[PDB]
Amino acid sequence: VVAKRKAETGNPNQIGATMPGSVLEILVKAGDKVQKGQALMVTEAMKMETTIEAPFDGEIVDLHVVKGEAIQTQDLLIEIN
Amino acid sequence: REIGLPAQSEIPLLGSAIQCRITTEDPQNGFLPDTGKIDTYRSPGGFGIRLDVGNAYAGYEVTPYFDSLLVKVCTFANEFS
Numbered sequence: 001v002v003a004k005r006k007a008e009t010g011n012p013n014q015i016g017a018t019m020p021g022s023v024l025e026i027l028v029k030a031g032d033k034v035q036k037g038q039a040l041m042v043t044e045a046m047k048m049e050t051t052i053e054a055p056f057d058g059e060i061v062d063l064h065v066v067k068g069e070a071i072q073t074q075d076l077l078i079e080i081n
Numbered sequence: 082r083e084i085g086l087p088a089q090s091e092i093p094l095l096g097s098a099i100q101c102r103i104t105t106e107d108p109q110n111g112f113l114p115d116t117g118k119i120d121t122y123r124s125p126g127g128f129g130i131r132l133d134v135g136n137a138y139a140g141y142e143v144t145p146y147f148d149s150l151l152v153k154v155c156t157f158a159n160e161f162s
Contacts, residue, residue, distance in 0.1 A: 018115075
């Protein structure tokens with residue numbers, strides 16, 4: 001049961017899961033350029049839907065989850081530069 | 082006679098008071114109530130301050146099942162300002 005890489009505390013380049021749930025859709029991939037507020041992925045928490053937004057302008061570095069993967073609070077979803 | 086309230090015209094009117102409810106509603110995320118563990122909870126006091134606490138203490142896990150209220154805060158003073 002390999003533990004998932006967590007998002008680093010206070011590292012605003014890393015987006016971690018805010019609550020347990022799962023990944024519905026991934027809207028972006030490694031390399032893309034992105035803008036503050038832009039949608040990056042959608043996740044479910046007790047069947048409510050959340051859209052993960054970019055914290056600022058920058059370039060996606062990598063994804064760390066796959067479609068329909070389960071996630072716990074603090075799990076690292078995506079890194080940005 | 083027994084509870085000790087005076088007649089209507091003698092019911093005191095002392096200054097003014099304000100109540101705010103502090104909740105986990107996130108005003109930058111459409112007032113969606115946040116959930117998760119409370120790391121730190123320091124409550125103020127002093128003259129003119131009344132607190133009626135809900136569920137908020139260091140270590141408490143705010144769940145998605147109930148309302149988002151952490152604490153009710155009232156202030157009171159001779160003058161509204």
